[PDB]
């Protein structure tokens, strides 16, 4: 089996600045890591969001270290990648990019990574990032056109392949959406829905069921009750513990009954982190398809939203929720 090293958390929120690519008048001042950033001055909103992201990652696995860069610039990325390789070589490096406060990406990885003060700085090419971090790695792209990034990444991998003939293809990617579509601007959802699905699958699953179902079969149960559910995420005797057990069992069952055994073991048995991410990924797929969004992964999987086992989950949820009042 393999292990991992520290997580590279790279955020680009630019709280208080609306990118020129969007026009927003709909009151969708949505949460980021369950924080409403406009209730605090920019410095505390940014630091607080950082801290919550850190905790969300710690909740899934104890870490050797995380490091976080809430600010630009490019030199900081170079130094971080170098340090990460120094504590490598075989263990996987995890990257997380948001870009919510940044203009939409393009073929060259355009991103607002600068020491200014309103400068349209840099085409921060994927190729250079591949050079800086050549070790096995996992990338998460929670952005408006993440599939475009995955496509460009593979094209640069082909370029490198051609150059070598005169740790590529050992890394995996999870993309928020296909290159040709945008993330939804829907009131009452978090602004970082993909991240929340990958890191907090129960809060999202329950809030989603409460707002999504056409007809509720449990009168009296609403968001005010779900957000007060007692228990712990590591105690099988509590409501939340039971829900996490059931969720894990169903997700693993679906993976077992859909994927080839080779992919099954490579994704769900050879590493704790990858297995956790893919188990939550299937949920993200099921939820996001209702918004006209299609998550994209580097290896392609058969569709799973059609599988009968999801109905069992819905029933179990209603049963548990019926005991809350």
């Amino acid at each position: 089996r393999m292990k991992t090293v520290s997580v590279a958390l790279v955020l680009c929120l630019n709280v208080g600045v609306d990118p020129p690519d969007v026009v927003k008048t709909t009151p969708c001042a949505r949460l980021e890591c369950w924080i409403d950033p406009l209730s605090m001055g920019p410095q505390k909103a940014l630091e607080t969001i950082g801290a919550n992201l850190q905790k969300q990652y710690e909740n899934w696995q104890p870490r050797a270290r995380y490091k976080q860069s809430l600010d630009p610039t490019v030199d900081e990325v170079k130094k971080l990648c170098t340090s990460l390789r120094r504590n490598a070589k075989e263990e996987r490096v995890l990257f997380h990019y948001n870009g919510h406060g940044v203009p939409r990406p393009t073929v060259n990885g355009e991103v607002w990574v600068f020491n200014k003060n309103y400068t349209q700085y840099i085409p921060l090419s994927i190729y250079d990032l591949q050079t800086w971090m050549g070790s096995p790695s996992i990338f998460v792209y929670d952005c408006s056109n993440a599939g475009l990034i995955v496509k460009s990444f593979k094209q640069f991998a082909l370029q490198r392949e051609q150059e070598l003939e005169v740790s590529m293809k050992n890394c995996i990617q999870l993309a928020a959406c296909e290159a040709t579509e945008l993330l939804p601007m829907i009131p009452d959802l978090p602004a970082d829905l993909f991240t929340s699905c990958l890191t907090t699958p129960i809060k999202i699953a329950l809030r989603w069921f409460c707002m999504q179902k056409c007809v509720s079969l449990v009168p009296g149960v609403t968001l005010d009750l779900i957000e007060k559910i007692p228990g712990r995420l590591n105690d099988r005797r509590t409501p939340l513990g039971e829900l996490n057990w059931i969720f894990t069992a169903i997700t693993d069952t679906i993976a077992w009954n859909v994927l080839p055994r080779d992919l099954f073991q490579k994704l769900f048995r050879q590493d704790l982190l990858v297995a956790s991410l893919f188990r939550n990924f299937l949920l993200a797929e099921r939820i996001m398809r209702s918004y006209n969004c299609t998550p994209v992964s580097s290896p392609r999987l058969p569709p799973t939203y059609m599988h009968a086992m999801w109905q069992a989950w819905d029933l179990a949820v209603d049963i548990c929720l019926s005991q809350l009042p």
């Binding site: 089996r1 292990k3 099988r236 894990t248 048995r269 050879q270 590493d271 704790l272 297995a275």
Partner: peptide
Amino acid sequence: ESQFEMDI
């Protein structure tokens, strides 16, 4: 160091 640990 398993992919899944529990105590039942």
